[PDB]
Amino acid sequence: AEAGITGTWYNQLGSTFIVTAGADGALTGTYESAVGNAESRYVLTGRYDSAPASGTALGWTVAWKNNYRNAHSATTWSGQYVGGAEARINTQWLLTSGTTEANAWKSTLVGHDTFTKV
Amino acid sequence: AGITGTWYNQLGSTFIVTAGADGALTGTYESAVGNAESRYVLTGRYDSAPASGTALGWTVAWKNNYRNAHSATTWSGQYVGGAEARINTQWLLTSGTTEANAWKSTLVGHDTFTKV
Amino acid sequence: AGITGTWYNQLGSTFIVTAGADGALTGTYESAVGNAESRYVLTGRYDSAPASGTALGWTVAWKNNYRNAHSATTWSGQYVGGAEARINTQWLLTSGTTEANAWKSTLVGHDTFTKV
Amino acid sequence: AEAGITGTWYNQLGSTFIVTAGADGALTGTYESAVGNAESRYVLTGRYDSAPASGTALGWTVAWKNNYRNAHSATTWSGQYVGGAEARINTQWLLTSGTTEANAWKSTLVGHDTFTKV
Ligand SMILES: O=C(O)c1ccccc1/N=N/c1ccc(O)c2ccccc12
Ligand SMILES: O=C(O)c1ccccc1/N=N/c1ccc(O)c2ccccc12
Ligand SMILES: O=C(O)c1ccccc1/N=N/c1ccc(O)c2ccccc12
Ligand SMILES: O=C(O)c1ccccc1/N=N/c1ccc(O)c2ccccc12
Known about the structure:
eight-stranded antiparallel β-barrel
């Protein structure tokens, strides 16, 4: 929940996700990545189910552009928050890169990330 | 400017968005499926300084004042401007589930948005 | 019968398949992309006793007598027969990579096959 | 390789994959599933890179129909074989169910399976 989700998380790559869950279902924070043509932090925005039933559905987006670099790509993570002892966020993600129309067919990667809460 | 406006997917859903100078996407989404009749809030990000399509994404949690589906969809794609502007995406829809049903909680698909 | 035949995707690739009574799919795929000019073997499965589309899938490893891309694509979808028959799919393309590049080894997409 | 891939594997759900890798790049075997509207074994067919460079690219399909049941669906696994001490097959999969044209938009699931060799 609000409290549940809010905090600092890390994924299997060593990436850092700092998030605040608002009462209106908003997610806002920053993402600090370990891989790609990256550097420094990036702004994230998302939504979550503020009135869950076991898991809490959520998703967020990161556009890989900050004041220092631009990779012309964006990633969206879709998954669920599972509270308890070992609170975790289990996700599947899609990374799309800006391409020409000829290359569009191979513009999207798919993967999975597991986040653990500090 | 180009992204800002009203769009529609193949299902007939309506995506009304405002693109900020800074890279933010804000707006509302009115579904023609799953089961709705109502609008939902959406939030996202986009490359505000593109190179040729413009990368973007947004999320919608399927909960409003009237109903709660306990699910969320994320769209990831690119905006291709011109005379016949389009937003080409691939999406992931995840439902809240018990751990036993977790293996099959996510659906994958593709949507094409146009201004008509 | 219906599935057996010659099909084409949006890229112009050619899919020649034979559907067995038993559920097997066998054939050849000639790519119009990535970078080819040549054919590759394909193998798959299909529901040989459908209920309304017919579920199927097949894999192509991108290695023939001439080249080796060290990759493979799997297509998963459904055949929808009628006057204007189609095969609607979603695909995964995985390249062999070092463990360090493993996170980004798979591309996702969608293809539509028709008889024209 | 042929020898590398050939054998018995299990995934995180307790499913069993028995496979034989042919010299011509063919994969043939049987799959025995722990989840779904399933029972008994099902035939699998696939292809793999018979002349790899680190990982070996491969993929296979299962149509969920045997002499005992039919769920009118098929799954395709795409991934790589990584040899060594802890030989594993890392995959991403797509499961499509036969549906009417109205429901086609929500006909496909996406997930990930990790196979360990006995
Ligand atoms: O970092 C993660 O945890 C991460 C997790 C899941 C998917 C992608 C990720 N990272 N993606 C990038 C990070 C930094 C960059 O400069 C990039 C440049 C181009 C494309 C992707 C990236
Ligand atoms: O609407 C689209 O254009 C749409 C486009 C892509 C993916 C999903 C979509 N819609 N999904 C739902 C809409 C309304 C609901 O109440 C739901 C309840 C449970 C799961 C999904 C939905
Ligand atoms: O051809 C299609 O219709 C096609 C359709 C969907 C997905 C992939 C495809 N083709 N992919 C390749 C074709 C030829 C190659 O040498 C490759 C080398 C590396 C990676 C992919 C390919
Ligand atoms: O079993 C795995 O390891 C498995 C792993 C990945 C994806 C799917 C799986 N299993 N899928 C089914 C198994 C048995 C069934 O009767 C089904 C009926 C309908 C849809 C899926 C299945």
